[PDB]
Design a protein around this motif. Sequence first.
Motif, PDB file in Angstrom:
ATOM      1  N   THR A 178     120.861  46.312  -1.567  1.00 63.01           N
ATOM      2  CA  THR A 178     121.590  45.495  -0.579  1.00 63.01           C
ATOM      3  C   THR A 178     120.608  44.840   0.373  1.00 63.01           C
ATOM      4  N   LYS A 210     118.401  46.231  13.115  1.00 66.35           N
ATOM      5  CA  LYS A 210     119.503  45.840  12.193  1.00 66.35           C
ATOM      6  C   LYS A 210     119.067  46.102  10.767  1.00 66.35           C
ATOM      7  N   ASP A 211     120.034  46.356   9.887  1.00 64.47           N
ATOM      8  CA  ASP A 211     119.758  46.574   8.444  1.00 64.47           C
ATOM      9  C   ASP A 211     118.821  45.457   7.930  1.00 64.47           C
ATOM     10  N   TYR A 212     117.884  45.809   7.051  1.00 64.17           N
ATOM     11  CA  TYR A 212     117.031  44.827   6.356  1.00 64.17           C
ATOM     12  C   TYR A 212     117.308  44.925   4.851  1.00 64.17           C
ATOM     13  N   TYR A 248     108.136  36.070   7.173  1.00 65.06           N
ATOM     14  CA  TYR A 248     109.507  35.802   6.652  1.00 65.06           C
ATOM     15  C   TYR A 248     110.365  35.166   7.786  1.00 65.06           C
ATOM     16  N   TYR A 249     110.239  35.619   9.033  1.00 64.00           N
ATOM     17  CA  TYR A 249     111.175  35.236  10.140  1.00 64.00           C
ATOM     18  C   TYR A 249     110.544  34.153  11.081  1.00 64.00           C
ATOM     19  N   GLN A 259     116.382  38.950   0.988  1.00 66.21           N
ATOM     20  CA  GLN A 259     116.587  38.430  -0.399  1.00 66.21           C
ATOM     21  C   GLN A 259     115.215  38.261  -1.089  1.00 66.21           C
ATOM     22  N   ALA A 287     120.285  42.459   3.612  1.00 59.22           N
ATOM     23  CA  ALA A 287     121.172  42.165   4.767  1.00 59.22           C
ATOM     24  C   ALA A 287     121.180  40.642   5.051  1.00 59.22           C
ATOM     25  N   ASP A 288     120.073  39.947   4.848  1.00 59.25           N
ATOM     26  CA  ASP A 288     119.973  38.508   5.244  1.00 59.25           C
ATOM     27  C   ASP A 288     119.125  37.748   4.219  1.00 59.25           C
ATOM     28  N   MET A 289     118.872  36.473   4.490  1.00 63.99           N
ATOM     29  CA  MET A 289     118.178  35.540   3.563  1.00 63.99           C
ATOM     30  C   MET A 289     116.733  36.002   3.352  1.00 63.99           C
ATOM     31  N   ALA A 290     116.072  36.532   4.379  1.00 63.52           N
ATOM     32  CA  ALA A 290     114.679  37.019   4.307  1.00 63.52           C
ATOM     33  C   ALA A 290     114.594  38.293   3.470  1.00 63.52           C
TER      34      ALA A 290
END
Lengths: 9, 276, 100
Positions: free
Chosen positions: B134, B121-123, B84-85, B141, B136-139
């Motif tokens: 919820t 950090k939140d995922y 993903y990253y 999603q 936290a970021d585009m990944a």
Amino acid sequence: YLQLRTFLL
Amino acid sequence: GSHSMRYFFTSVSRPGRGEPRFIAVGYVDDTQFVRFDSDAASQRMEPRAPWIEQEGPEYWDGETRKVKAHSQTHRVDLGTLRGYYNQSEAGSHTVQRMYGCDVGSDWRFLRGYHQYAYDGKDYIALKEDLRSWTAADMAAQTTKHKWEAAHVAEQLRAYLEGTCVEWLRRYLENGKETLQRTDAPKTHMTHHAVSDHEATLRCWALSFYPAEITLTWQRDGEDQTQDTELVETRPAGDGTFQKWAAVVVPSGQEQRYTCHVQHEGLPKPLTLRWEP
Amino acid sequence: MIQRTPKIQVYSRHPAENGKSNFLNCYVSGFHPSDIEVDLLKNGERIEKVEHSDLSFSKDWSFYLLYYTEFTPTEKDEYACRVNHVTLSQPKIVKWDRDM
């Protein structure tokens, strides 16, 4: 008592 | 009052391309009751409390199978997140997961949790409605869409509102002597002359359970935060907790200052004053 | 990648008394990532046989560990906790102070 199922990111 | 059951999972890929560390710890409130640690060459879910140790071979085989399933989940997750990253395998990365349930004084469901962090950090997190995510970021999603399409939230709600609550109640009944106790803090005040001009007053709370506590300073019965210091609540190592709070006061003014201690184990909040 | 530096507390499980068996604790909290080196020192020298809690974490995802050993304190003997972490350019030494 752990969850029975497996979920993948 | 309230009770919770929580599982904390840490998965650490190592520098380079060998086996990740996997550790799983379970708590009821602030009492650890199980562990599995790959860095301890664990083969089984292991007990950390008398009241869990009395469970039979069926329970222990079942928890061992499931913790090994959780380990294999996180093994996949480390690979998925690198994808993903767009990260190489050379780096060390961390996945954390927490889930569990809270019950009220009536031992009824209040809240469930199921949430992840990646590299501190939140995922992704299950919301309090236990129906929605919820991200936290585009990944995250990507995980959210997959978990919505796959109806994951509905299977987690069944565990969090049902099984999780039912097993916490069994643990509370079996461990009643340990888990349904409150140990009130043992409180005292110290005085350390900094100079001729200032002193430190240090308000102590020792051998309390559970960990939750409030230490607050007042001056002439008014809230005092200037010139104060308060340490994180810390474990004594015997299943109780310690904390202190301190204030730096001008010489001769010690009598203006009061320390206020609130803890579920106290019949009423305490007030401490320096006693020459 | 979020890194956080450990908070260190060095303290005894029980109020310290010379020739009374006690536990020396080094509690490290608020740190990320989880790999951390914690040594307990007696008179500046690493204590070989130390125990630790199981790695767990707080609501904000930051880790905490307790390192501990059985010990008998005396007036002379001095104790510290030595901590290294990727956030620390060199080990941090926190001395045990009986009144903290």
